[PDB]
Amino acid sequence: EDHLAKELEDLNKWGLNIFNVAGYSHNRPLTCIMYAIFQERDLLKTFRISSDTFITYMMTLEDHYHSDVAYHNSLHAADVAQSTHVLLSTPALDAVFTDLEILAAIFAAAIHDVDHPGVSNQFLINTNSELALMYNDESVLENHHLAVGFKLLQEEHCDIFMNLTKKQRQTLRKMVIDMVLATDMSKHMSLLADLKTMVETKKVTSSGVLLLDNYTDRIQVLRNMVHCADLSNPTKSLELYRQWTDRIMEEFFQQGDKERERGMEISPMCDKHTASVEKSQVGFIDYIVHPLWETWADLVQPDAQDILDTLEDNRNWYQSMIP
Numbered sequence: 573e574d575h576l577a578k579e580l581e582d583l584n585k586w587g588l589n590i591f592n593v594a595g596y597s598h599n600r601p602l603t604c605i606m607y608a609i610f611q612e613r614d615l616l617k618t619f620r621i622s623s624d625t626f627i628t629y630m631m632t633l634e635d636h637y638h639s640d641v642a643y644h645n646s647l648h649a650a651d652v653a654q655s656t657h658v659l660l661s662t663p664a665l666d667a668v669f670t671d672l673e674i675l676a677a678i679f680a681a682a683i684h685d686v687d688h689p690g691v692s693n694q695f696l697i698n699t700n701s702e703l704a705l706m707y708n709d710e711s712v713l714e715n716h717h718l719a720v721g722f723k724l725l726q727e728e729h730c731d732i733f734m735n736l737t738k739k740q741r742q743t744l745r746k747m748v749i750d751m752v753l754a755t756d757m758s759k760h761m762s763l764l765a766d767l768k769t770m771v772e773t774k775k776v777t778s779s780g781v782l783l784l785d786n787y788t789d790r791i792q793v794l795r796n797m798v799h800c801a802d803l804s805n806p807t808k809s810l811e812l813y814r815q816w817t818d819r820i821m822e823e824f825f826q827q828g829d830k831e832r833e834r835g836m837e838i839s840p841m842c843d844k845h846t847a848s849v850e851k852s853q854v855g856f857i858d859y860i861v862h863p864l865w866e867t868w869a870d871l872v873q874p875d876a877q878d879i880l881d882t883l884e885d886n887r888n889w890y891q892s893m894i895p
């Protein structure tokens with residue numbers, strides 16, 4: 573309608589408000605934004621992806637995210653895809669990525685938490701869940717998110733990559749898997765350390781554009797870009813960041829309830845009777861989000877200085893909300 577179109581004017585911008593697009597799209601944010609992103613990039617024409625086939629795949633995919641989960645629903649997927657779309661345009665990365673790589677990073681973002689149950693890998697591992705048994709306690713949710721996303725591409729009416737070459741399907745699949753598995757927070761530190769090393773040896777053209785030699789370097793940046801997009805909520809406007817905070821805290825607190833019922837040890841940050849929503853965000857920004865975005869800012873300087881200023885401002889707002 574007229575409201576959705578106005579909101580989509582900010583499709584290529586960090587200030588896009590995904591909750592508004594959700595309200596104006598019959599509550600199908602992921603389908604909406606994926607279609608918008610794909611048209612915007614000429615990806616359908618480039619990969620001969622049929623419009624019908626693409627829409628059907630996206631609606632089914634959206635349907636497999638759970639609507640009764642506070643945070644890990646289709647809104648978050650849609651947020652990570654849209655933010656990955658903006659990050660792919662950073663001036664410092666101009667013309668560095670093939671269209672297959674661009675295609676893989678946005679697809680990875682869309683499917684990256686599909687069928688999320690609203691509990692963490694640790695919880696699934698400690699309750700001897702079927703998912704943890706299937707996956708041997710290693711990146712349990714992430715392996716599953718990839719398995720569901722690639723499973724939906726198997727049926728004929730839903731295979732959006734059919735017109736890619738065999739070689740292209742193969743290379744995309746390797747990159748996608750790499751990206752979703754990189755969203756597993758137990759790998760954050762190794763990822764952050766490896767990204768710092770890549771900044772140290774950073775090489776550019778006269779145009780202030782990054783020089784990535786081989787595949788290894790390009791996928792290292794995409795891995796990190798998707799991970800930053802996933803941990804991007806504290807970098808968005810404060811009003812958006814606070815909506816995301818309430819949604820994740822709700823999900824974490826419902827996990828502390830499930831744990832207390834089962835008589836398990838309550839995880840302190842998931843404990844609604846003891847944890848501060850305000851301290852949780854400061855600690856999250858100081859030890860995880862800032863160190864990551866600071867390093868990303870260095871890689872693409874000064875393209876992300878605004879995001880970093882906003883992050884610092886949001887961190888200080890949460891700090892002031894602690895007495």
Ligand SMILES: Nc1ncnc2c1ncn2[C@@H]1O[C@H](COP(=O)(O)O)[C@@H](O)[C@H]1O
Nearest residue numbers: 685757802803805816817820852853856
């Ligand atoms: N606002 C937040 N406060 C605390 N932790 C967060 C917040 N946003 C993201 N995270 C963490 O980052 C992870 C990202 O992975 P995922 O939850 O699977 O989307 C979450 O599981 C949280 O542990």
Ligand SMILES: [Mg+2]
Nearest residue numbers: 684685713755
């Ligand atoms: Mg995840």
Ligand SMILES: [Zn+2]
Nearest residue numbers: 684685755802
């Ligand atoms: Zn996520």
